[PDB]
Amino acid sequence: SAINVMKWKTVSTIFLVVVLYLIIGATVFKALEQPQEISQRTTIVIQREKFLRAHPCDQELDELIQQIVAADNAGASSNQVSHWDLGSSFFFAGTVITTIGFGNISPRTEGGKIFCIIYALLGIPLFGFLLAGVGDQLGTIFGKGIAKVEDTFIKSQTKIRIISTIIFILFGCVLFVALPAVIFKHIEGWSALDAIYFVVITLTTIGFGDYVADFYKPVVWFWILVGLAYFAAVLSMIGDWLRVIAKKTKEAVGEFRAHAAE
Amino acid sequence: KTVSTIFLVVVLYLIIGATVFKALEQPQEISQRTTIVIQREKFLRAHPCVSDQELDELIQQIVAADNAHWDLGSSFFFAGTVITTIGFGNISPRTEGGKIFCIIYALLGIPLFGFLLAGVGDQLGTIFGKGIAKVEDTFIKWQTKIRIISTIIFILFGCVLFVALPAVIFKHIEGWSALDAIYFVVITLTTIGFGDYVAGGDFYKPVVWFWILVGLAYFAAVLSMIGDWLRVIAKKTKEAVGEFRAHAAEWTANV
Ligand SMILES: CCCCCCCCCCC
Ligand SMILES: CCCCCCCCCCC
Ligand SMILES: CCCCCCCC
Ligand SMILES: CCCCCCCC
Ligand SMILES: CCCCCCCC
Ligand SMILES: [K+]
Ligand SMILES: [K+]
Ligand SMILES: [K+]
Ligand SMILES: [K+]
Ligand SMILES: [K+]
Ligand SMILES: [K+]
């Protein structure tokens, strides 16, 4: 089991890198959010006691808020709109098989949960075959257009790969990031950032849910379908970049430690 | 193409799924929402002063307080959700810089985490590789069919270690139900992560993330096996329709 140690060595080193990466990330987020956290939560204590002494008609303001936060975990106008309607249950399933899972709508029935479990364990693999085919299809659609555009530059075989990938990322980021984010900004009424924030969080299959988007809805899911293929390639390229940088900082430390002051 | 045929299958699968969910949830939806109109008027009637005009104001500000933790630890767990693409959403950035950082952090963290999980998976797959090699030879001197006893051992033990036991731990600790625990486990380790249940809602919180790390490797294999069985069944039903359509009409020749 020689290489098995040569592997465990290499997983452990990656482990500590990720732990570092998270610690670095952890520090940066709480440095960027905890100020806004306190400002928003002192201004909520202001609004509490502004509504208390302006209506002393009281432990039970609380027992309203508990019932409103109990109305949080399910979403004039005493008649509301339907979450689980003909359409939102389709989009819900779409989030389940794509592993996005925004959580804006989630099952509360015990049977719905059990169904959601079985639906995912079968839907996630099934969707993978679709996305794999959609990705393969799109990658070969590119393959034709890139083969056309490279021969017009073969005025070396090696540096034209780089112009190629830049064409790829540029176009894709126009088609799959810029344009649908603009459409969301103009429709969902988001900011220039919240749109691009939504696009990434969705197509990176993270899906927090803080932002979630009858011709509009289908184009969104189909966008998600093809965009997930796009970031699949994008994230895959970034993984290669990292391997390059990782094993070329590995040679650079081998440089230093052998030279180690001349 | 074969992609178009798969496309329509998924569409059909979603339509089937769509119908089943709204049949399972929209009843509870209305029951919960008529009993909220009851509670609204019950609080209007019963507080002549907290009148109609003093209530929606508040609810909008409370649902604006739904919009919103961030301590030494929760920001670590947040980053853990970002690189694992789980993203429960229970805590999400509100600063414009935090969002921009979250974007850059994910585009770099997601690939980085994949290498870890790939190594953790490879490591765990070879740890089983030893234990399974020892349990198969005891069934050989006793073979294409021993593969099947093997995978059943795999799924059983893994479901015990990675699903049953940590769900029980959550049920005692987070005070969940027998289902909500297993519901949480799947939704987390299938990297879906709705957020309706989160173990984060100091010995406990590290073991959870490390559990997630290794469990994600487990369902990675599980979902991968399920993909193969689908590929089998898809190809087995492809031959079966070729069976029917030729035999259908072996008969059609006879006139
Ligand atoms: C507490 C009961 C939980 C039942 C879960 C059954 C899951 C069946 C999975 C079939 C693929
Ligand atoms: C619930 C059992 C059926 C699972 C899906 C079957 C997929 C068949 C694919 C045909 C190409
Ligand atoms: C953010 C840089 C991490 C460097 C890790 C050091 C191990 C070579
Ligand atoms: C199992 C539900 C879908 C069945 C489709 C059969 C493939 C043509
Ligand atoms: C305004 C944000 C631009 C997107 C950041 C890209 C980081 C590589
Ligand atoms: K994934
Ligand atoms: K999610
Ligand atoms: K995910
Ligand atoms: K939320
Ligand atoms: K997710
Ligand atoms: K979520």
SS (H, E, C) B49-97: CCCHHHCHHHHHHHHCCCCCCCCCCHHHHHHHHHHCCCCCCCCCCCCHH
Among the partner residues B24, B63, B78, nearest to A29 by beta-carbon distance? B78
Among the partner residues A47, A71, A130, nearest to B10 by beta-carbon distance? A130
Quote the ligand 2 centre to B146 CA distance (angstroms).
Answer: 26
Contact call for A7 and B122, based on CB within 8 A: yes
Cβ atoms within 10 Å of A203's Cβ, excluding its own: 25
Among the partner residues A80, A129, A208, nearest to B89 by beta-carbon distance? A208
Among the partner residues A112, A120, A121, nearest to B25 by beta-carbon distance? A112
Whether chain A has a CB inside 8 Å of the CB on B224: the answer is yes
Residues of A in contact with B116 (CB under 8 A): 11, 14-15, 17-18
From atom 3 of ligand 3, which residue's Cα is the shortest distance away? A17
Q: Which two tokens stand for residue B151?
A: 């995978």
Are the beta carbons of B57 and B31 closer than 8 angstroms?
A: no
Whether chain B has a CB inside 8 Å of the CB on A134: the answer is yes
Distance (Å, whole) CA B32 – CA B23: 15
- B175: region left, alpha or beta (phi > 0 left; psi from -120 to 50 alpha): left
Whether chain A has a CB inside 8 Å of the CB on B6: the answer is yes
Instruction: Please return the burial class of A49, using the count of CB atoms within 10 Å of its CB with bins 0-12, 13-18 and 19+.
Output: exposed
Q: Which two tokens stand for residue B206?
A: 């590290």
Contact call for B179 and A113, based on CB within 8 A: yes
DSSP code at position B199: T
Whether chain A has a CB inside 8 Å of the CB on B129: the answer is no
Are the beta carbons of A11 and B127 closer than 8 angstroms?
A: no
Q: What is the DSSP string of chain A?
A: -HHHHHHHHHHHHHHHHHHHHHHHHHHHHHHHHHHHHHHHHHHHHHHHHHHHTT------HHHHHHHHHTTTT----SS---SSSTTHHHHHHHHHHTT----SS---SHHHHHHHHHHHHHHHHHHHHHHHHHHHHHHHHHHHHHHHHHHTT---TTTHHHHHHHHHHHHHIIIIIIHHHHHHHHHH---HHHHHHHHHHHHTT---SSS----HHHHHHHHHHHHHHHHHHHHHHHHHHHHHHHHHHHHHHHHHHHHTT-
Quote the ligand 2 centre to B230 CA distance (angstroms).
Answer: 6
- How large is the C-alpha radius of gyration of chain B? 26
Q: What is the resolution of this structure in A?
A: 3.4
From atom 4 of ligand 3, which residue's Cα is the shortest distance away? A17
Nearest C-alpha neighbor of A35 from the set B97, B234, B59:
B97
State in Å, rounded, how far the first CA of chain A is from the last one.
37
Cβ atoms within 10 Å of A178's Cβ, excluding its own: 14
Are the beta carbons of B79 and B91 closer than 8 angstroms?
A: no
Residues in chain B: 255
Are the beta carbons of A143 and A167 closer than 8 angstroms?
A: no
For residues A72-97, b (16+ Cβ closer than 10 Å) or e, as one string?
Answer: eebeeeeeeeebbeeebbbbbbbbbb
Q: What is the DSSP string of A116-139?
A: HHHHHHHHHHHHHHHHHHHHHHHH
Domains in chain B (CATH in brackets) are: 1-255 (1.10.287.70)
Q: Which two tokens stand for residue A79?
A: 């008649």
Chain A residue with Cα closest to B26? A84
Distance (Å, whole) CA B176 – CA B197: 9
Measured CA distances, B79 to A147, B122, B208, B213 (Å): 40, 24, 14, 13
Residues of B in contact with A126 (CB under 8 A): 9-10, 13, 227, 230
Are the beta carbons of B72 and B65 closer than 8 angstroms?
A: no
Residues of B in contact with A140 (CB under 8 A): none
Distance (Å, whole) CA B69 – CA A37: 8
Whether chain A has a CB inside 8 Å of the CB on B79: the answer is yes
User: How far from the centroid of its chain's Cα atoms is residue A28's Cα?
Assistant: 19
Are the beta carbons of B93 and B102 closer than 8 angstroms?
A: yes
Cβ atoms within 10 Å of B53's Cβ, excluding its own: 7
| B25 SS3 class | helix
CA distance A149 to chain B (A): 25
Distance (Å, whole) CA A148 – CA A126: 34
Q: What is the DSSP string of A49-65?
A: HHHHTT------HHHHH
Are the beta carbons of B179 and A110 closer than 8 angstroms?
A: yes
